[PDB]
Amino acid sequence: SAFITFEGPEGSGKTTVINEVYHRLVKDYDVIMTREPGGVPTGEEIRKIVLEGNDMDIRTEAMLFAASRREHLVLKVIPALKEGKVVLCDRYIDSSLAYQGYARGIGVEEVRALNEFAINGLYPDLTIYLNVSAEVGRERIIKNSDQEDLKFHEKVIEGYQEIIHNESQRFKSVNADQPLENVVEDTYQTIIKYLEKI
Amino acid sequence: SAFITFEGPEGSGKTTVINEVYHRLVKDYDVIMTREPGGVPTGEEIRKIVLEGNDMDIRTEAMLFAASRREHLVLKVIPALKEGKVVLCDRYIDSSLAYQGYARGIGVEEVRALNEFAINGLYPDLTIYLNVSAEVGRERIIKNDQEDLKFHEKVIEGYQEIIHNESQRFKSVNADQPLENVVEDTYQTIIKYLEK
Ligand SMILES: Cc1cn([C@H]2CCCN(S(=O)(=O)c3ccc(O)c(Oc4cccc(Cl)c4)c3)C2)c(=O)[nH]c1=O
Ligand SMILES: Cc1cn([C@H]2CCCN(S(=O)(=O)c3ccc(O)c(Oc4cccc(Cl)c4)c3)C2)c(=O)[nH]c1=O
């Protein structure tokens, strides 16, 4: 079994990369792809509170992402890993660390302690980081889909750099500045090399 | 202003004590009575998930009590304190520590770290612990099963460990006395604090 998470800011091509990689992996492995809340009812209900929120306090928001994470982990991830599956998860702990911790300003270590309570030692086996420059990311955002948004995008990227710097061995950084066909190939090859080594 | 929390297991006379102590403090203080979620919409929505849940994972439950606590703190407690109010809060951090931490078995220090994230340094100014024996507590519960009895005992045991740990904001009131005396001791303890 393998627990693989995918991380990156907006404009990293993450959605496209995960879907294409997953599609290729389904041929050779017992693999599932998911994201939080992922249809788990308690998680979907927590997510509705987050979306229905009016200027929600960032710590309440962090605690709700962490509660949704646990429900999804407990009801979807853990049962699949117990069946010997490769689990591909779109966003996990590192998303809370970069967005809530770094970009929102709660502090990475504080959001980590919160998330360690939620995951209870279930860290990913491998994390694919879709390493897109802020400039390429910005251009992908305007293309494929104000000024405060630009700075928030940069801080998310800066947040992911600090996370990798403090925990490199868990991470595999993929050049997301390349055309998406190449990002897909590099991500697939990185995963295959990991899966065939275990 | 003052943030005063009330802690204790069921059967400690907590409801009666808070209401009566509120009735006496209002003469001299701008005081409010509250409990989480306390009408805060986001908190009420979180509480509905907790109550509507079926065999919910204890850590998700702990994280939801902590999320409801923050919403209540941010939208009710803090604005009340800013107005100069005495805030009487029925259950706060120590309840998560005794119930989720100790009695449910997650571990007190783990639930503390979770709750320190939620309160972000906003510890109570004073915490009234209504120190009732399990036996007196049990009798008060029946007046107002084996698994329930054992859970009640573990909650009390949990509060003993918490009180043993931190000794500054905690004030232990003998809740084995008749309720009139528990009310008087609690009121006098609060007055001594508010005056000094
Ligand atoms: C998993 C995760 C995601 N994000 C963001 C990634 C980028 C998109 N945002 S968003 O607020 O625009 C958003 C987009 C789609 C959503 O569907 C959403 O709602 C939730 C998603 C997952 C879990 C929960 Cl509780 C809500 C929020 C979420 C965080 O800030 N922290 C996390 O832990
Ligand atoms: C504040 C608090 C209370 N409790 C319990 C105290 C005894 C009663 N229980 S209960 O689960 O039986 C319960 C009774 C009535 C309720 O109304 C309730 O729902 C909530 C109360 C406060 C906050 C939230 Cl999110 C739900 C739960 C909650 C905890 O276990 N942890 C805490 O942090």
UniProtKB/Swiss-Prot annotation, chain A:
TM regions (residue ranges): none
The species this protein was found in: Staphylococcus aureus (strain MRSA252)
UniProt-listed PANTHER family: THYMIDYLATE KINASE, UMP-CMP KINASE 2, MITOCHONDRIAL
Catalytic activity: dTMP + ATP = dTDP + ADP
One Pfam family cited in the UniProt record for this chain: Thymidylate_kin
UniProt GO cellular component terms: cytosol
Protein family (similarity comment): Belongs to the thymidylate kinase family.
Keyword hit for Transferase: yes
Root EC class: transferase
Matches recorded under PROSITE patterns: THYMIDYLATE_KINASE
EC number: 2.7.4.9
Key words of the record: ATP-binding, Kinase, Nucleotide biosynthesis, Nucleotide-binding, Transferase
One term of GO molecular function: ATP binding
Protein name as annotated: Thymidylate kinase
GO process annotations (BP): dTDP biosynthetic process; dTTP biosynthetic process; dUDP biosynthetic process
Highest taxon, organism lineage: Bacteria
Positions bound to ATP: G8, P9, E10, G11, S12, G13, K14, T15
Role, per record: Phosphorylation of dTMP to form dTDP in both de novo and salvage pathways of dTTP synthesis.
